[PDB]
Amino acid sequence: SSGLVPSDDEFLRGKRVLVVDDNFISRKVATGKLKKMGVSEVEQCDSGKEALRLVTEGLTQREEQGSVDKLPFDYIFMDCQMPEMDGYEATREIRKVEKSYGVRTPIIAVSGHDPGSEEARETIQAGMDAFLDKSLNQLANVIREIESK
Numbered sequence: 308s309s310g311l312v313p314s315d316d317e318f319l320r321g322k323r324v325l326v327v328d329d330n331f332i333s334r335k336v337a338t339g340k341l342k343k344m345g346v347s348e349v350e351q352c353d354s355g356k357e358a359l360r361l362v363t364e365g366l367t368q369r370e371e372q373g374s375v376d377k378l379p380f381d382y383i384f385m386d387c388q389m390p391e392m393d394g395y396e397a398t399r400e401i402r403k404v405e406k407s408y409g410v411r412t413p414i415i416a417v418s419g420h421d422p423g424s425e426e427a428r429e430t431i432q433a434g435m436d437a438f439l440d441k442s443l444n445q446l447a448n449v450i451r452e453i454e455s456k
């Protein structure tokens with residue numbers, strides 16, 4: 308399954324995206340798909356803490372410069388299961404950093420399996436926007452749904 312949490316080679320043109328995944332191969336695969344959809348800029352990192360850092364720094368910079376776009380990333384694809392700080396905790400911390408800027412980055416949970424009851428709960432509590440099977444086959448639909456909302 309894939310959905311909201313309570314060709315296409317120009318599909319993401321104009322867009323800047325962050326891929327977060329502790330697995331080297333998953334990360335490359337995601338960035339590949341996205342580059343194929345015309346993504347203007349893909350950034351990738353290998354942990355929740357790194358993600359947190361890039362987002363924190365990017366929001367501060369954009370605020371300091373009076374940037375037109377205040378979000379450093381139009382979308383973040385967040386792997387759920389990672390050592391140390393998982394995707395839930397990182398997303399929770401990202402939402403807390405965001406409060407002071409009055410913005411909300413779309414964050415899409417990425418996992419190799421459908422969530423159980425506990426993960427599903429964490430999904431909502433963390434403040435993720437959507438959830439995407441790692442095939443990434445539903446990527447464009449999930450983003451359209453986010454955009455409609």
Ligand code: BEF
Binds near residue numbers: 386388418441
């Ligand atoms: F390590 Be993940 F939640 F695909």
Ligand SMILES: [Mg+2]
Binds near residue numbers: 330
């Ligand atoms: Mg992982």
